[PDB]
Amino acid sequence: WLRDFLWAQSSQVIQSYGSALSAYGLIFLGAHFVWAFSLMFLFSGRGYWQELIESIVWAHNKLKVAPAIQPRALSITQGRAVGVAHYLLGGIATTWSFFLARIISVG
Amino acid sequence: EVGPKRGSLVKILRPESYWFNQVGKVVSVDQSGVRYPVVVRFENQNYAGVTTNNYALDEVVAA
Amino acid sequence: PFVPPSWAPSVFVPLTGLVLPAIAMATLFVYIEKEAP
Amino acid sequence: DIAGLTPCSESKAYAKLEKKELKTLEKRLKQYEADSAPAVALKATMERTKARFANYAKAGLLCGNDGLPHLIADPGLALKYGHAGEVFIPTFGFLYVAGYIGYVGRQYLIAVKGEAKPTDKEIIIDVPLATKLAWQGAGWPLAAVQELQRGTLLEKEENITVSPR
Amino acid sequence: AHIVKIYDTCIGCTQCVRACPLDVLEMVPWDGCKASQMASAPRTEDCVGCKRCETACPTDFLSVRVYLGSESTRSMGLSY
Amino acid sequence: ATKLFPKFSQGLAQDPTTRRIWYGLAMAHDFESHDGMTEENLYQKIFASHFGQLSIIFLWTSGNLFHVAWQGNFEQWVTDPVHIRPIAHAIWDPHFGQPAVEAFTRGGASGPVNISTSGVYQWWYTIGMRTNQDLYVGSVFLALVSAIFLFAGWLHLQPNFQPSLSWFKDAESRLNHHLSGLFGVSSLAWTGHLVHVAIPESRGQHVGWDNFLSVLPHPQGLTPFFTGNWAAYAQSPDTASHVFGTAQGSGQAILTFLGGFHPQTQSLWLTDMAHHHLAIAVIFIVAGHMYRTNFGIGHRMQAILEAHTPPSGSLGAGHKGLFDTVNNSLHFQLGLALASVGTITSLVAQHMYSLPPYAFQAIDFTTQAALYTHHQYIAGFIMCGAFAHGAIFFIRDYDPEQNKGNVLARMLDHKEALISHLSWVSLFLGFHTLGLYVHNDVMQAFGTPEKQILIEPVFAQWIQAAHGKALYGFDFLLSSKTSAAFANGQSLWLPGWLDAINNNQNSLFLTIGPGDFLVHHAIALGLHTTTLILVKGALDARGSKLMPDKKDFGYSFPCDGPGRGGTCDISAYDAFYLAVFWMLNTIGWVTFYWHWKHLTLWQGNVAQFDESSTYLMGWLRDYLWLNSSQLINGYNPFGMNSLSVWAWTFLFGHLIYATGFMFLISWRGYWQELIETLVWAHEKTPLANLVYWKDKPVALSIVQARLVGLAHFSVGYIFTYAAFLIASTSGRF
Amino acid sequence: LDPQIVISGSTAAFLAIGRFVFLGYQRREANFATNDPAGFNIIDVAGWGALGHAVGFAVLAINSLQG
Amino acid sequence: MKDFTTYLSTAPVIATIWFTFTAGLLIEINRYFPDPLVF
Numbered sequence A: 001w002l003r004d005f006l007w008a009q010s011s012q013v014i015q016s017y018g019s020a021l022s023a024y025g026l027i028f029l030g031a032h033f034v035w036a037f038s039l040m041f042l043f044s045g046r047g048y049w050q051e052l053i054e055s056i057v058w059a060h061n062k063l064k065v066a067p068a069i070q071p072r073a074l075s076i077t078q079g080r081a082v083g084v085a086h087y088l089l090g091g092i093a094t095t096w097s098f099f100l101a102r103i104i105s106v107g
Numbered sequence B: 001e002v003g004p005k006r007g008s009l010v011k012i013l014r015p016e017s018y019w020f021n022q023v024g025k026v027v028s029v030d031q032s033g034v035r036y037p038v039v040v041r042f043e044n045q046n047y048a049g050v051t052t053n054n055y056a057l058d059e060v061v062a063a
Numbered sequence C: 001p002f003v004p005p006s007w008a009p010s011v012f013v014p015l016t017g018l019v020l021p022a023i024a025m026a027t028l029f030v031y032i033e034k035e036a037p
Numbered sequence D: 001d002i003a004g005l006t007p008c009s010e011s012k013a014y015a016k017l018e019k020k021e022l023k024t025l026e027k028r029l030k031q032y033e034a035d036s037a038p039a040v041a042l043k044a045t046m047e048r049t050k051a052r053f054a055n056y057a058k059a060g061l062l063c064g065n066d067g068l069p070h071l072i073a074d075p076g077l078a079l080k081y082g083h084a085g086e087v088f089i090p091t092f093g094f095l096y097v098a099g100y101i102g103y104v105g106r107q108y109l110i111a112v113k114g115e116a117k118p119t120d121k122e123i124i125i126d127v128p129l130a131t132k133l134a135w136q137g138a139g140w141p142l143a144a145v146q147e148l149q150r151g152t153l154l155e156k157e158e159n160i161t162v163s164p165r
Numbered sequence E: 001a002h003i004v005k006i007y008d009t010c011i012g013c014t015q016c017v018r019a020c021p022l023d024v025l026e027m028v029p030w031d032g033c034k035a036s037q038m039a040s041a042p043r044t045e046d047c048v049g050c051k052r053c054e055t056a057c058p059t060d061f062l063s064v065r066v067y068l069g070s071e072s073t074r075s076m077g078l079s080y
Numbered sequence F: 001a002t003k004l005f006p007k008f009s010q011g012l013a014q015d016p017t018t019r020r021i022w023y024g025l026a027m028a029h030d031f032e033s034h035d036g037m038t039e040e041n042l043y044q045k046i047f048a049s050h051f052g053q054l055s056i057i058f059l060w061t062s063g064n065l066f067h068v069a070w071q072g073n074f075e076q077w078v079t080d081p082v083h084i085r086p087i088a089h090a091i092w093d094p095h096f097g098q099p100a101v102e103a104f105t106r107g108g109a110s111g112p113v114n115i116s117t118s119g120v121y122q123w124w125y126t127i128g129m130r131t132n133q134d135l136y137v138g139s140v141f142l143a144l145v146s147a148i149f150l151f152a153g154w155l156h157l158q159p160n161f162q163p164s165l166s167w168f169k170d171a172e173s174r175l176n177h178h179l180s181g182l183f184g185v186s187s188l189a190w191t192g193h194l195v196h197v198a199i200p201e202s203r204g205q206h207v208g209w210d211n212f213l214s215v216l217p218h219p220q221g222l223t224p225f226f227t228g229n230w231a232a233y234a235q236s237p238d239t240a241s242h243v244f245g246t247a248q249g250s251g252q253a254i255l256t257f258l259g260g261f262h263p264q265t266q267s268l269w270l271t272d273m274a275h276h277h278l279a280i281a282v283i284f285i286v287a288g289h290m291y292r293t294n295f296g297i298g299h300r301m302q303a304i305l306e307a308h309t310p311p312s313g314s315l316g317a318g319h320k321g322l323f324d325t326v327n328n329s330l331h332f333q334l335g336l337a338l339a340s341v342g343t344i345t346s347l348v349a350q351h352m353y354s355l356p357p358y359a360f361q362a363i364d365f366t367t368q369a370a371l372y373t374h375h376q377y378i379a380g381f382i383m384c385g386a387f388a389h390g391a392i393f394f395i396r397d398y399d400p401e402q403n404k405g406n407v408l409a410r411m412l413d414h415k416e417a418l419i420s421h422l423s424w425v426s427l428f429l430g431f432h433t434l435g436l437y438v439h440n441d442v443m444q445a446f447g448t449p450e451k452q453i454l455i456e457p458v459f460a461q462w463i464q465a466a467h468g469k470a471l472y473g474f475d476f477l478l479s480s481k482t483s484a485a486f487a488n489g490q491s492l493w494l495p496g497w498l499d500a501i502n503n504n505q506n507s508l509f510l511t512i513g514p515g516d517f518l519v520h521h522a523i524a525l526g527l528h529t530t531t532l533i534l535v536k537g538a539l540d541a542r543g544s545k546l547m548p549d550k551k552d553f554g555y556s557f558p559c560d561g562p563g564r565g566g567t568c569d570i571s572a573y574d575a576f577y578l579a580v581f582w583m584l585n586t587i588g589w590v591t592f593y594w595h596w597k598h599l600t601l602w603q604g605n606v607a608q609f610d611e612s613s614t615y616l617m618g619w620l621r622d623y624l625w626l627n628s629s630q631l632i633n634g635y636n637p638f639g640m641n642s643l644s645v646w647a648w649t650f651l652f653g654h655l656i657y658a659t660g661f662m663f664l665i666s667w668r669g670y671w672q673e674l675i676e677t678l679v680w681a682h683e684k685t686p687l688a689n690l691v692y693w694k695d696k697p698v699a700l701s702i703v704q705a706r707l708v709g710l711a712h713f714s715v716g717y718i719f720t721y722a723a724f725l726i727a728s729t730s731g732r733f
Numbered sequence G: 001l002d003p004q005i006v007i008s009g010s011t012a013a014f015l016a017i018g019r020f021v022f023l024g025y026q027r028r029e030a031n032f033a034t035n036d037p038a039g040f041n042i043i044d045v046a047g048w049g050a051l052g053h054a055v056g057f058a059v060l061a062i063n064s065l066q067g
Numbered sequence H: 001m002k003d004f005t006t007y008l009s010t011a012p013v014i015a016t017i018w019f020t021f022t023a024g025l026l027i028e029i030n031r032y033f034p035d036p037l038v039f
């Protein structure tokens, strides 16, 4: 599966630059990105982010540029919802770019 | 009538307080001998969503 | 010079990776399940 | 010139890349009739390509062995060898725009903070005030220096919250 | 067993006692706050570590604090 | 009832669940937490544990020497080190098929064997090893050394041999000995081996315990050394026509400063390395006479630190109280050791590949790749460990009252500034380094490569010019033939160095361009981000605005519950766990850069990297996709080849990596409820209910799950890249 | 440079400077019974003597390099 | 009408308008000054 399907049929999307399927190549990379970006939210916890925000808020307080609406880390449930959304978006978009570039070229 | 005046603005000095080095309003000071008689109200809510807390006379300073 | 026989692997590999693991696992499991007097 | 690079104007790889690019566009311009909208579009891209290769060379950009323009970021080399429109001037252009946004936003937050409900003015933007500050942001650099010199830009540590330590 | 502790900052709101789902806390007469009552933790052996009491505590900082400790059948809330 | 394991924690021993087994193994080396632990017993246990570690290391080395001398082709590789592939050990797998036996049979046949990528063949050959007898004897010696450290470990823990805590605290005496003896005398002894054995072996002369006394290292003996005519030892070195291992083109010098590399071996000169160890040995031995122990002379570290206080109050009380802070904190001492060893490990990786010290090492591309990646990944883990122990130090040992006003306490006083600034730097690097790659990818996609942003690494090229490289035309220092720095060293190392730094076939200061600029900023992004995560964890380890009393909960705790908005991953241990992902990402980027730049140099078309490294599609297609073909064809419907083990391992790493995702994404609650259903099923199943469990089955803990997930994630990460790296380099070369 | 002369003179120089110039400073910095009036113990001799030997060999070593 | 203008002053609306203005400005600039690599 990995060699004769993914590696062999990815040639169309990886070689689309300079053509009309170039967008599928860009989306193929962008989708691999969104998917990896989801792992930050899926593997982390709000406790760490809240503290990091505290030190950033300090810099905004020091320069008198701190917002009245207090910055807060995403809720635990929101953290999980953001992670799954970016995981599905990235993963499905990656297959989408791979499928459309491959089929349009060898259709 | 010990304690800061009601309606006055004081700065919290309790280190573990969310409003440390922050200013709130003196809601009321319990003349009875309670450990923390100064009731202070704050505009910004803490992580728990609370906007009020009790502090001792020493934990507060006019500011 | 300090050279083991040709059968070495035919015997050492079986013992180390199958027999010894089983013996180790047996004694270890017993100790953990044992309760303090 | 610098780093062993060569002017794009004298690079052979730069010239071959321009031909390679125009030959792809020309191979496609053939399958279409001369006045066909497709033909007009491919021609305008070919003209834009010719202007880019010419404009880049005229700007005195240097090209590596790849035949592609390389940017000089050392202030000393850029000024002495005519390469300041590549990173230096862009730097002061961005810094002006970025400080403009920051100083205006800071001025807005400070203005809405003295109101009844600052949080409300952050979800519902006081457009008139926002537009006023947006226009007055052109002289931010001098205002920022004047605030830095009056000691009004920063906050006193005694008024800023911190953890127990 | 988990370590549960009550601090003098307690205001006698009784919220922690009402929030506890294993009856680890109760209200005892006191003279340190206006409510004349302070939370107590006499049944910590039944504590699981849910920390609902801390979520119910409105003082800053918390007057009731839970420190997860030795694990038991009760501490792990095991029905088996 | 109370089980026996673990004996160090009655709490765990009284845990009736499976958690007792996991935690007993997880908290066995945390002596400070063991029941009835005293500081003196803590030190004695560590001392014995250190002897145990040494025993294991020496047995590991003896084992390595034995398998090469018994199953490899060292006596054949030495004859032709350019075309003979070194054998690591023999393969005895009864699950193998006749084809696999043939595919793995190689290196002089002798049955299925694994090729070695460790570099011990070039190393032992360079140090004078020439026969399996030599390898066999060394193996025996090291095995004997291992047994002594194991006995010393046992003895120094028995009564009448248990060192006192005061002995463990004698810092001035321990540092003097380690600098003069452990470092200086050891380096001096190594210079003796190189001069008396390695160099004669490189010149074709056998020198062993049989004739070392009846053999003269130099024709003039020690008369030059004791008369001061040291230069004599540098006269007549090996020439460019020197065939390593023979007297052909061989000279007579024992200590030189030629510089550059031996022409045939492409490695550093033995005479230059002999002189190097001699010089550093002298420096160390002297340095070991700085601290006061028993003779009235020397420095008192406490007096030194106490004196270092800027007069303007810029550093508060300066280093006051730091002596006791460091001397009483093993975590502080471990933090420094890891931070130093980790940085030194990366230096080894950077210097060994650029200045290869072992003969025929630079031609073994697979070994070069393996060594760099191996040391860079070990360095990354050690750096992560250093900060982890710094955070533990702050929580367990830091005493604010004894460090009042000192540099350490000042750090805590401006932690928000430190973290916020690390946040800003990381953000800048991330937004711009990503933005430029994306811009370049879009320009490549729209077919306009002349429109991509390609900033020249002028500052690095200027440094390379300073070192001699004239390719950039900066003309200064070693690149200028009229410079004093050029003239002063013209009769010493410069000639050899300039020849090497101006040769574009080695790895000495490789040429760099816009692609190298972008990847270097990506490395800076990773280093700052990983530091931001680790630093933030150590500074906030004792408390934050969200949890002001974190110090009362310790280094590792699950969370503080969903209250206060939610507090998942709030412990300093949780910060280390998150930092490991960024460390693996950083070492991944650095190792990818190193491998791709060398693959293109080794193939002979540096232009591919120079033109494809400026966009991420180039990295994915010209490095990962293109170099994966032979590996993924290790086994196929048409058969299998020697690369089958790597194809199987490559996929094995992908499986473990993804298995980690389950422990990392799915959390305990869901699993605990599933297990409870299984407990009902087992108790309700007839015959099965007859057998029962001694430990109540429970889901893994929150902290445990994060560790198990990170371990699975880290193991797959390493196994996958190691399989790809070796296969791509070996198969292509 | 005569090896015997260089080292011999070097050692004597350091022993002298450490016995009549830096002895007080070292003692103050310092914050084996010797009947020496200035209390110059053997360990002190070993130290300054070593310094002298090192400096002497350094001079001979560079001189042997002929420049 | 006052409430409608208040709704048009809401964060998302202003963001859409401001970003549409900024995007438009940049697009038009590249439409009249194509391929701008250097000053």
Ligand code: CLA
Residues within 6 Å of the ligand: D074, D075, D076, D077, D080, F458, F459, F462
């Ligand atoms: C921020 C990092 C950085 C780095 C790594 C460099 C690096 C370099 N700069 Mg520099 N520069 C910088 C920032 C930096 N610059 C900034 C922010 C400015 C704005 C003022 C300048 C302005 C500047 C000038 C005017 C010049 C350089 C020059 C140089 C090159 C030689 C300078 C030198 O001797 O040492 C490195 C320099 C620095 C570490 C800091 C600033 C550079 C000093 C102040 C200039 C002194 C140059 C001196 C005359 C040596 C060259 C002699 C001759 C060839 C002119 C060198 C590769 C020289 C050059 O090569 O021009 C052709 C040159 O004359 N730079």
Ligand code: CLA
Residues within 6 Å of the ligand: A055, A056, A057, A059, A060, A063, A065, D101, D102, D103, D104, D105, D106, D108, D109, D125, D130, D133, F420, F421, F423, F424, F427
């Ligand atoms: C008035 C707006 C404003 C200002 C003046 C600043 C200023 C600053 N921020 Mg910041 N920030 C802002 C908004 C602002 N921020 C917003 C809305 C967010 C949420 C994304 C953040 C998130 C943020 C982080 C995570 C960090 C900073 C940091 C910093 C400091 C380092 C420099 C920097 O800008 O880094 C870069 C800041 C950004 C990339 C955020 C971009 C925010 C946009 C561009 C500002 C637009 C504001 C608003 C929409 C305009 C209203 C105008 C009004 C008329 C209606 C600096 C003092 C860094 C720091 O602490 O360093 C010490 C830091 O790590 N900020």
Ligand code: CLA
Residues within 6 Å of the ligand: F046, F047, F050, F051, F052, F054, F167, F168, F170, F171, F173, F174, F175, F177, F178, F180, F181, F182, F183, F186
């Ligand atoms: C001459 C006196 C002497 C010597 C030789 C040693 C030697 C040693 N002591 Mg020690 N010690 C001494 C006096 C001495 N001590 C005294 C007087 C005291 C009382 C104050 C102590 C108290 C003491 C304690 C409490 C401990 C030690 C420990 C150790 C061991 C450190 C383990 C180690 O890191 O590996 C060896 C380290 C080195 C060889 C240093 C070199 C490291 C460099 C960076 C490597 C570079 C190598 C080269 C560049 C490349 C190699 C390539 C190739 C060969 C692979 C080590 C063998 C530890 C121990 O017991 O371990 C069991 C420890 O816990 N000592």
Ligand code: CLA
Residues within 6 Å of the ligand: F025, F026, F027, F028, F029, F030, F031, F334, F338, F381, F382, F383, F384, F385, F386, F388, F392, F555, F556, F573, F576, F707, F711, F715
């Ligand atoms: C000289 C080096 C050194 C030393 C002496 C110590 C010593 C100590 N560390 Mg430590 N550490 C180090 C380096 C070191 N560390 C490095 C380099 C890192 C970065 C990775 C860490 C990160 C670290 C953390 C995060 C923690 C410690 C902790 C501790 C303390 C107790 C933990 C323990 O040992 O229990 C036993 C350790 C284990 C049982 C190991 C766990 C199993 C791991 C996942 C390895 C599994 C790999 C697996 C075999 C792979 C299989 C692959 C195969 C199938 C092919 C202890 C005093 C803990 C602590 O502070 O105490 C509260 C703790 O939280 N360390």
Ligand code: CLA
Residues within 6 Å of the ligand: A033, A036, A037, A038, A039, A040, A041, A042, A043, A044, A052, F423, F426, F427, F428, F429, F430, F431, F434, F525, F529, F532, F533, F578, F579, F581, F582
């Ligand atoms: C590809 C995956 C990925 C990516 C891209 C990042 C990126 C980042 N991580 Mg991260 N991380 C990851 C995985 C990832 N991580 C994983 C798996 C873990 C383990 C769980 C971590 C754990 C971790 C920790 C602990 C921390 C970070 C931090 C950071 C930030 C460091 C500062 C920086 O570089 O600013 C650069 C900014 C960017 C690279 C973002 C680009 C800007 C976007 C893409 C442009 C906007 C696009 C468009 C206009 C709008 C799109 C949205 C649309 C719907 C409108 C950074 C944004 C640190 C941090 O928070 O910073 C202070 C930090 O503390 N990470």
Ligand code: CLA
Residues within 6 Å of the ligand: F655, F658, F659, F660, F661, F662, F663, F665, F666, F670, F674
């Ligand atoms: C590649 C990663 C991976 C793998 C292998 C699995 C595997 C599994 N998941 Mg899972 N999962 C993953 C990622 C993964 N998951 C991720 C990222 C998430 C987050 C969304 C989840 C979330 C998730 C949930 C919520 C659930 C599972 C469940 C399951 C199990 C389903 C029952 C089953 O098939 O048993 C059979 C086992 C296998 C098919 C594994 C095959 C292993 C090989 C074939 C066996 C080889 C054994 C070997 C010879 C032993 C000897 C080794 C030697 C050293 C001695 C299963 C074992 C369900 C469950 O708990 O079980 C009912 C469940 O509810 N997963």
Ligand SMILES: CC1=C(/C=C/C(C)=C/C=C/C(C)=C/C=C\C=C(C)\C=C\C=C(C)\C=C\C2=C(C)C[C@@H](O)CC2(C)C)C(C)(C)CCC1
Residues within 6 Å of the ligand: A063, A065, D073, D074, D075, D087, D088, D091, D098, D099, D100, D101, D102, D103, D106, D144
């Ligand atoms: C006024 C303003 C703001 C700014 C506020 C503040 C306090 C900003 C803080 C600035 C500080 C403390 C800077 C501290 C150190 C800065 C240093 C040392 C400068 C480094 C710059 C260097 C070395 C120059 C590099 C180069 C130059 C010459 C330009 C280019 O050529 C590129 C390069 C790298 C070669 C607010 C509120 C964010 C809102 C907004 C407007």
Ligand SMILES: CC1=C(/C=C/C(C)=C/C=C/C(C)=C/C=C/C=C(C)/C=C/C=C(C)/C=C/C2=C(C)CCCC2(C)C)C(C)(C)CCC1
Residues within 6 Å of the ligand: F282, G011, G015, G045, G046, G047, G048, G049, G050, G051, G053, G054, G057
């Ligand atoms: C008592 C007195 C006196 C005096 C006497 C004398 C004469 C003394 C001297 C003594 C001496 C006579 C001293 C010396 C010392 C020396 C030394 C102690 C040395 C050492 C050496 C070293 C340490 C070396 C090392 C090394 C080597 C081995 C190798 C190479 C390198 C080097 C060189 C570094 C008088 C008369 C005044 C007065 C009265 C009494």
Ligand SMILES: CC1=C(C/C=C(\C)CCC[C@H](C)CCC[C@H](C)CCCC(C)C)C(=O)c2ccccc2C1=O
Residues within 6 Å of the ligand: A040, A041, A042, A044, A045, A046, A047, A049, A050, A072, A073, A074, A075, A076, A078, A079, A080, H015
């Ligand atoms: C990154 C991360 C965060 C931090 C993520 C945040 C804070 C989201 C950031 C959203 C935006 C960027 C904040 C500000 C939004 C403004 C409306 C943007 C205005 C700027 C103008 C240009 C429009 C968490 O809070 C978290 C919580 C639980 C598990 C994992 C994570 C997690 O991974």
Ligand SMILES: [Ca+2]
Residues within 6 Å of the ligand: F128, F130, F201, F206, F207, F208
């Ligand atoms: Ca020999």
